[PDB]
Amino acid sequence: SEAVYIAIEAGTLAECEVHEGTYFSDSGDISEAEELAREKFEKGEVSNFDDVEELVKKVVAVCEELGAEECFSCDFD
Ligand SMILES: [Zn+2]
Questions:
Q1: 31 to each of 5, 63, 71, 76, how far by Cα in Å?
Q2: Which long-range contacts link 27-31 to residues 24+ away (Cβ below 8 Å)?
Q3: Measured between alpha carbons, how far is residue 22 from residues 4, 26, 42, 54 in Å?
Q4: Measured in angstroms, how far is the CA atom of residue 54 from the centroid of ligand 1?
Q5: Which of 18, 49, 59, 66 could form a disulfide with 37 if both were Cys (CB 3.0 to 4.6 A apart)?
Q6: Backbone phi, psi, residue 23, to 5°
Q7: Residue 73 Cα, ligand 1 centroid: separation in angstroms?
Q8: Ligand 1 centre from 22 Cα, in Å?
Q9: Ligand 1 mean position to 23 CA, how many Å?
Q10: What is 1-77's CATH topology?
Q11: Ligand 1 centroid vs 13 CA: distance in angstroms?
Q12: Which of 68, 75, 66 is nearest to 4 (CA)?
């Protein structure tokens, strides 16, 4: 599903645009990613027309699947 990536790409987490593979979701509020995802998603029906509770759940899952909280590459030349 891409709807998730979009829901999260809508502004759920952040990743170094100079370091591909290195990501980092708003640390301190992982749930915020879901809520925000539900806000954008709900504030903008996606083609997939999936469920909010589903997206959010998938938003927290994906976000968690990224297990990223910083761009260690920031030190990797
Ligand atoms: Zn970086």
A1: 16, 10, 20, 29
A2: 27/69, 27/70, 30/60, 30/63, 30/64, 31/60
A3: 18, 14, 28, 26
A4: 31
A5: 59
A6: -130, 175
A7: 5
A8: 7
A9: 9
A10: Arc Repressor Mutant, subunit A (1.10.10)
A11: 14
A12: 66
What's the residue count for the chain? 77
Q: Which element (helix H / strand E) includes 24? A: strand 23-25
User: Would you state the structure tokens that stand for residue 48, as one six-digit string?
Assistant: 């997939």
Phi, psi angle pair for 37, to nearest 5°: -65, -40
Q: How far is the CA of 16 from the centre of ligand 1 (A)?
A: 5
Distance 64 CA to ligand 1 centre (A): 19
Q: Which residue has the tokens 């370091």?
A: 19
- 3 CA from centroid of ligand 1 (Å): 26
Distance 48 CA to ligand 1 centre (A): 32
